[PDB]
mmCIF file of C-alpha atoms in Angstrom:
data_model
loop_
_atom_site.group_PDB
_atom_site.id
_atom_site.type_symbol
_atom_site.label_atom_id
_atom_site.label_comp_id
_atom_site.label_asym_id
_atom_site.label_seq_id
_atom_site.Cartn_x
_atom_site.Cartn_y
_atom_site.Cartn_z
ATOM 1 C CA UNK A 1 109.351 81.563 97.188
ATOM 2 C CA UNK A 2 108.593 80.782 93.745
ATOM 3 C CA UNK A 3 110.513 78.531 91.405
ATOM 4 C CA UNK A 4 110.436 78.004 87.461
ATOM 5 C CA UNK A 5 112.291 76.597 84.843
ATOM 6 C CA UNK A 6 114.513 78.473 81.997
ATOM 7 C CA UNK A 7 111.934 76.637 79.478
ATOM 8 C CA UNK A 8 109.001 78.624 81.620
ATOM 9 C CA UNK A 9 110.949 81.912 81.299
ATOM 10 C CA UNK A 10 110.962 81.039 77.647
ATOM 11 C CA UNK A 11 107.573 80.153 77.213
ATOM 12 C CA UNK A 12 106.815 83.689 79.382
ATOM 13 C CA UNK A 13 109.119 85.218 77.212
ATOM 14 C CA UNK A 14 108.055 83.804 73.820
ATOM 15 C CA UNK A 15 103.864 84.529 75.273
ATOM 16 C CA UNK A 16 104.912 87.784 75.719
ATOM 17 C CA UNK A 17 106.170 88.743 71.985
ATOM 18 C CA UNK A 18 103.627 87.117 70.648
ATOM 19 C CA UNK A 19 101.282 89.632 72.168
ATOM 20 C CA UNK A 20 102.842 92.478 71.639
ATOM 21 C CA UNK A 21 101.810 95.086 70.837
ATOM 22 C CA UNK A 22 98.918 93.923 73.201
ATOM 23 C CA UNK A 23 100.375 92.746 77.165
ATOM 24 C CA UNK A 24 100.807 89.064 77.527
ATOM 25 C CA UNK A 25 97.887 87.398 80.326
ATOM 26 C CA UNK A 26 97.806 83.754 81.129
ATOM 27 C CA UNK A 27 98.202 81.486 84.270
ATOM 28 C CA UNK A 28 101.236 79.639 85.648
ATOM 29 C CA UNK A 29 100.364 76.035 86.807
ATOM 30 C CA UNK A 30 102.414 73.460 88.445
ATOM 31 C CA UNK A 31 102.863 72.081 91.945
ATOM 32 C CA UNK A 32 102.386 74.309 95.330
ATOM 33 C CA UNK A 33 103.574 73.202 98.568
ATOM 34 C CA UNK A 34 104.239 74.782 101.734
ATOM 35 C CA UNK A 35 102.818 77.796 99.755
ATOM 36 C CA UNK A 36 105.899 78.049 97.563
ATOM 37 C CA UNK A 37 105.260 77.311 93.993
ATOM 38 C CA UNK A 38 106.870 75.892 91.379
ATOM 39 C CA UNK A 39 106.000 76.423 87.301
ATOM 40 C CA UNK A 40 106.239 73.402 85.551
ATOM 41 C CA UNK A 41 104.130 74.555 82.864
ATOM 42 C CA UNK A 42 103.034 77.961 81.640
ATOM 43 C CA UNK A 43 99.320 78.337 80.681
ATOM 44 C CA UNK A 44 99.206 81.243 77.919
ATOM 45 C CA UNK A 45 95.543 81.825 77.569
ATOM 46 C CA UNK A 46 96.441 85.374 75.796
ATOM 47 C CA UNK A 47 94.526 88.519 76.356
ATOM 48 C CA UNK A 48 90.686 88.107 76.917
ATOM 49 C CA UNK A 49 90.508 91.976 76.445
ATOM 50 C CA UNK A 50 91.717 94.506 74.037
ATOM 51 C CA UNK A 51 93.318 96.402 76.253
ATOM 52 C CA UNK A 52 97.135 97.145 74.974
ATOM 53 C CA UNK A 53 98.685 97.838 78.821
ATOM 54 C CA UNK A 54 95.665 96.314 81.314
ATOM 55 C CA UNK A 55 95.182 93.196 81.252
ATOM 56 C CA UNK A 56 92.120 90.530 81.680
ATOM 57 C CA UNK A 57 91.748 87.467 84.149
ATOM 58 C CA UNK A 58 90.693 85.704 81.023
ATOM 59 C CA UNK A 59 87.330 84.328 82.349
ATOM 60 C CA UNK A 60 86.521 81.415 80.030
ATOM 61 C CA UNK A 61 90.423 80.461 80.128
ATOM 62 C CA UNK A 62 90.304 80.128 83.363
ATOM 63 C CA UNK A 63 88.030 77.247 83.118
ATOM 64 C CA UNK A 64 89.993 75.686 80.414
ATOM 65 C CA UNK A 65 93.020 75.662 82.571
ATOM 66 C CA UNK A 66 91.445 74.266 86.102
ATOM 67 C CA UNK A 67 90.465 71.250 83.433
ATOM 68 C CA UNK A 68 93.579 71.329 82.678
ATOM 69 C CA UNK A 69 95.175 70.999 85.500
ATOM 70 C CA UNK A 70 92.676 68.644 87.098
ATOM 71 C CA UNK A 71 93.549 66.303 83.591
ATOM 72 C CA UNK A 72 97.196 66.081 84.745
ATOM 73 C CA UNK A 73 97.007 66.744 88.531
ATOM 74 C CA UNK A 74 98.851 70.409 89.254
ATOM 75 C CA UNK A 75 97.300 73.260 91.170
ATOM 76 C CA UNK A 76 96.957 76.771 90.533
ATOM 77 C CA UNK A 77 99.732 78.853 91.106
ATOM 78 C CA UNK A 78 99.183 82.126 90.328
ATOM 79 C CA UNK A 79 99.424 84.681 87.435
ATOM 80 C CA UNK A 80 101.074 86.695 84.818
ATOM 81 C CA UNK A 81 101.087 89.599 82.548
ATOM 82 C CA UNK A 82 103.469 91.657 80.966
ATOM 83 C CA UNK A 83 103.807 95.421 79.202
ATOM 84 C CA UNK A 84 104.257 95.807 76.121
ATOM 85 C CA UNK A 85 107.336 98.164 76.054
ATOM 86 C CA UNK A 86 106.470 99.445 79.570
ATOM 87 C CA UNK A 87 108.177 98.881 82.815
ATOM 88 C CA UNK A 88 107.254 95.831 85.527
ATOM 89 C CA UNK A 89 105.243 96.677 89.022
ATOM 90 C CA UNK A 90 101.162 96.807 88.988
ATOM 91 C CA UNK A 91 99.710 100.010 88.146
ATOM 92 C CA UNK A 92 96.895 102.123 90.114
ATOM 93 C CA UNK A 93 94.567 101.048 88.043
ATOM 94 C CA UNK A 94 96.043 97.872 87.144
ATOM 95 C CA UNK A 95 96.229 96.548 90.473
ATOM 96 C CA UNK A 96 92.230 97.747 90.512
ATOM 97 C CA UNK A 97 91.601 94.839 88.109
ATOM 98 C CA UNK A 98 93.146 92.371 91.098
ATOM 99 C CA UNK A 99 89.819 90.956 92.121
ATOM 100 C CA UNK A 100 91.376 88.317 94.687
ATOM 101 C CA UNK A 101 92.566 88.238 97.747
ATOM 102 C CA UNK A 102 95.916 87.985 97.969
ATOM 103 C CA UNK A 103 97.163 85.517 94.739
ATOM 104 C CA UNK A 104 100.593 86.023 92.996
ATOM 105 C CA UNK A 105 100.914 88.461 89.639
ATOM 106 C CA UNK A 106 103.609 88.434 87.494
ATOM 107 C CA UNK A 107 104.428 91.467 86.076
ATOM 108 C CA UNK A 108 107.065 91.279 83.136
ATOM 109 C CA UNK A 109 108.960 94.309 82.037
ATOM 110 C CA UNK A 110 109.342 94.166 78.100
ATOM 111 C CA UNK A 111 110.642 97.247 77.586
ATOM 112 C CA UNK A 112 113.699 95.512 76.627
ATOM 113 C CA UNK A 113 114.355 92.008 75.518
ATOM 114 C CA UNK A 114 118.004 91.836 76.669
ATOM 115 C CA UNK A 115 116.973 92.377 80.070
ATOM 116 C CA UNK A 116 113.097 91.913 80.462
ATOM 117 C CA UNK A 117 112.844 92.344 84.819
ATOM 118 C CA UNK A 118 111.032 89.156 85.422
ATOM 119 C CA UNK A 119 109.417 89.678 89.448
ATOM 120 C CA UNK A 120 105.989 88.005 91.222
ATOM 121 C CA UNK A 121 103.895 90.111 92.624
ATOM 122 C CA UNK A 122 101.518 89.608 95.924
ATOM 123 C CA UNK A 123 98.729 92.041 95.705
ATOM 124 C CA UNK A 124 97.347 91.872 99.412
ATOM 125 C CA UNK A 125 94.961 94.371 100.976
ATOM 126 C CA UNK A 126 97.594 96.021 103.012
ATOM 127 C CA UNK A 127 99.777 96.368 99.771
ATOM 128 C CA UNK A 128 101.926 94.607 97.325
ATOM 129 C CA UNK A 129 104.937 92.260 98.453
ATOM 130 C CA UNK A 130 107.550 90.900 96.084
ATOM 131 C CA UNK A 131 108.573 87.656 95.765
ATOM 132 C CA UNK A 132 111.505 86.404 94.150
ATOM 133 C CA UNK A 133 112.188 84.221 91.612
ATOM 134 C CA UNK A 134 114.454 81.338 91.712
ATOM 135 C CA UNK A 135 115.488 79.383 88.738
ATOM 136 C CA UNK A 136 115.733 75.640 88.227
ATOM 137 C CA UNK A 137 117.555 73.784 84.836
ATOM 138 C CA UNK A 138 115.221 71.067 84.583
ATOM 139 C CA UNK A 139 111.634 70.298 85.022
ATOM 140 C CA UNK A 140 110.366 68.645 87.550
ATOM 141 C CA UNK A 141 110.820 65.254 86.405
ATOM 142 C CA UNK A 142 108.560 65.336 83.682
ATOM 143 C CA UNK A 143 104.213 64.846 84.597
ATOM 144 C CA UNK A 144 105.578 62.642 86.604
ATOM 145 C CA UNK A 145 102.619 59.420 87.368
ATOM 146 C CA UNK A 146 103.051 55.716 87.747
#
């Protein structure tokens, strides 16, 4: 299972305008426990390619955002990237660029802004599963640290 926040939907959301016409790439980051994952913060690292429909894994980004993480303490969750105007699900090719074993993309559907199909995607060697996303109203209690 994997949970967010409306704020992370926004910040998805918002990532993925701002790309546009280009697809929206980035990282989701937050906590991860008993393999479910929660966003508690988006990582937009925008596109590392020039591709306008496949996307990078943002190489140098990537290193910005492990810091990042290791800064405030959260763990890798996963990925996202979203078409321009296109529909959701990972491509023939697209899924090509999937150069892990078996990590979570998030494919967003923009072809429509009043109902952009939001879904995470496990790209495994036998195939692709879908996991679903569950919504939370509030963070989770701020970075919390004492």
């Amino acid at each position: 299972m994997i949970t967010l926040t409306k704020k992370q939907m926004e910040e998805m959301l918002a990532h993925a305008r701002q790309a546009l016409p280009n697809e929206a790439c980035g990282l989701l980051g937050g906590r991860r426990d008993g393999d479910d994952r929660w966003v508690e913060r988006v990582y937009p690292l925008n596109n590392l390619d020039q591709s306008p429909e496949h996307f990078s894994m943002d190489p140098r980004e990537q290193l910005t955002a492990v810091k990042d993480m290791r800064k405030n303490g959260w763990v890798m969750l996963g990925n996202f990237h979203s078409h321009p105007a296109t529909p959701a699900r990972p491509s023939a090719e697209d899924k090509r660029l999937a150069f892990d074993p078996s990590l979570s993309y998030l494919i967003i559907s923009l072809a429509e802004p009043q109902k952009p199909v939001c879904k995470s995607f496990l790209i495994k060697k036998d195939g692709v599963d879908e996991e679903e996303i569950i919504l939370k109203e509030e963070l989770e209690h701020h970075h919390h640290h004492h």
